[PDB]
From a paper:
We chose a derivative of DMAP as the artificial cofactor due to its low steric demand, which will facilitate its inclusion into the protein scaffold. The protein host around the cofactor was rationally designed on the basis of high‐resolution crystal structures obtained after each variation of the amino acid sequence. The location of the catalyst is in a shallow cavity at the surface of the protein. The system was evolved through repeated cycles of mutagenesis, activity tests, and structure determination. According to the presented structures and calculations the catalytically active site is too shallow to undergo interactions with 1.
We describe here the use of an artificial cofactor employing the well‐known biotin‐streptavidin system to catalyze a Baylis‐Hillman reaction. As protein host, we chose streptavidin, as it can be easily crystallized and thereby supports the design process. There are several examples using streptavidin as the host for these cofactors, since its natural ligand biotin binds strongly (K d∼10−15 M) and is easy to modify with catalysts at the carboxylic acid group. No enzyme is known to naturally catalyze the Baylis‐Hillman reaction, a very versatile and atom‐economic C−C bond forming reaction for the production of various functionalized compounds and intermediates of active pharmaceutical ingredients (APIs).
Residue numbers in the entry:
A (entry chain A), B (entry chain A), C (entry chain A), D (entry chain A): 11 to 135
Write the structure that this text describes.
Amino acid sequence: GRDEAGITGTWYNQLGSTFIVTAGADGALTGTYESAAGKAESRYVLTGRYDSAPATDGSGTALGWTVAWKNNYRNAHSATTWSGQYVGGAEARINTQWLLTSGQTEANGWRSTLVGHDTFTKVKP
Amino acid sequence: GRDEAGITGTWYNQLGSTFIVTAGADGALTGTYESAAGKAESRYVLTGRYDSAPATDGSGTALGWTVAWKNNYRNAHSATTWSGQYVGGAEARINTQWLLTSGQTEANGWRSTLVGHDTFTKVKP
Amino acid sequence: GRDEAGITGTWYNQLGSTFIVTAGADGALTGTYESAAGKAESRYVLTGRYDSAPATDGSGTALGWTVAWKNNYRNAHSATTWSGQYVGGAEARINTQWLLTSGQTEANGWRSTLVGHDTFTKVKP
Amino acid sequence: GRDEAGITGTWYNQLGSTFIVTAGADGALTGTYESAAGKAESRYVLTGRYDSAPATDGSGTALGWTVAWKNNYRNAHSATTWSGQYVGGAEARINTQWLLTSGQTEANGWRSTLVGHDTFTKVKP
Ligand SMILES: O=C(CCCC[C@@H]1SC[C@@H]2NC(=O)N[C@@H]21)NC1CCN(c2ccncc2)CC1
Ligand SMILES: O=C(CCCC[C@@H]1SC[C@@H]2NC(=O)N[C@@H]21)NC1CCN(c2ccncc2)CC1
Ligand SMILES: O=C(CCCC[C@@H]1SC[C@@H]2NC(=O)N[C@@H]21)NC1CCN(c2ccncc2)CC1
Ligand SMILES: O=C(CCCC[C@@H]1SC[C@@H]2NC(=O)N[C@@H]21)NC1CCN(c2ccncc2)CC1
Ligand SMILES: [Cl-]
Ligand SMILES: [Cl-]
Ligand SMILES: [Cl-]
Ligand SMILES: [Cl-]
């Protein structure tokens, strides 16, 4: 992986959530997520993928991951996906937008999905 | 997994893409994705998560997955995340919304992410 | 307006909501919206814009509109924007994706916005 | 309008775009938008709506607006909708997420819509 070394490690977003990830040489992301917001407690499993051979023209590295919000402490019957890109350097960042879907009945499916954006950095707010 | 049996298998969306997935007892999703649209050829790895203990009131099962659009044939420097829910029964479906992020420079990050929606069923269009 | 005649009139979405709109020669959209779903009763004002000189290569006509969910009967402290395109012909359609923002405190702004998609046609479901 | 006075005026986002708006007592937004990014030149008409009787518990004021990207200088065959909320006070802000739809053929409709987020303040970056 080109940014295997750059992506692997601990990241923090603007809410104070903590994203711990290992980028594998093949394109795998694995790790844990702890949200500072919402119906969440302690760490949750995450998994995702990244482009292991990004362009070399200054473009970011595309990636995504998923958390289902069930662990031994809580189940929020929901899942978030973050889609974004890693941008390396002295002020490295993972810039994302996310979709948070809740389990809903038929009648309520139209209101099942929240959208937002998180920016992750290597130092915490 | 409650819908481990229901989610595992082959799904098809409205574009004719094919989503092959195994749901693990823990909440894992693993499999392959073949897109009928866009800068894609053959199968790509996917990974994701689902709620393995959904509500029993008729609500769907929340889930999500990621594809990074790199394989041995093509690299589109991009990744899609699908966030949605599985709804079982005779007309089982996975209803999703997705975010497709491309690697972009600084100047172009504002235009890095497409949004859309896919509906997957067990029989093809 | 090129599709002034095509856009003007009554449209219905998959939820059974009714969208009544007048497209002005300049690019204006004005009208009323009645939602079959959610915290809504009777008609609400809408306003928006469309491309009054679309491409002639078979592409759709880009457009958007807003409803704030306050009228004399109800206030849901929220607003939806639909962004999409009109596609003319015998099976004319307005294909959209929408963002529904609620008024929220600081602590809750991350969960203020729902996302979805509506397809409008000239005949009702 | 409760925040008629607060919303009316000039706002600037993180890209340096300028949003000039008048909030009417009824819930109307009218004005002009000048984008610092993308296929845009000079000012474009906008129109939208806001909640003219927001909650009084510290929640923001929901609102939305549309720009179709046609004026006398340029036509980008596209339209953006911003959905968000006004938050008053010494550091007043309009926090938004947006959908930017381009006119596309049938074959390409799946890739017609960009998503992002803008934060507007009364002082420029
Ligand atoms: O709060 C969570 C789980 C934690 C999400 C944390 C989010 S992930 C994006 C953002 N970035 C973070 O770092 N943290 C936040 N899930 C909800 C979803 C909406 N829910 C319902 C309930 C009833 N009807 C509809 C919807 C209730 C449960
Ligand atoms: O086409 C793909 C990869 C395949 C995506 C297939 C998509 S996934 C959601 C939907 N459901 C499917 O089943 N299939 C489609 N990626 C693009 C993204 C945008 N790209 C750029 C290039 C230059 N600047 C900006 C953006 C070009 C590459
Ligand atoms: O239901 C409505 C107003 C009517 C929306 C109708 C929607 S527009 C897109 C779709 N297409 C239609 O044709 N119809 C639907 N608004 C909500 C939003 C979420 N709300 C809260 C409350 C508390 N906390 C958070 C959020 C409650 C009020
Ligand atoms: O660039 C613009 C018009 C100006 C948009 C400015 C955007 S509004 C949200 C953000 N906040 C701002 O303040 N400024 C930006 N429109 C594009 C859309 C994508 N386009 C295509 C072309 C071909 N195929 C697919 C898509 C090309 C034209
Ligand atoms: Cl609910
Ligand atoms: Cl580009
Ligand atoms: Cl609330
Ligand atoms: Cl194109």
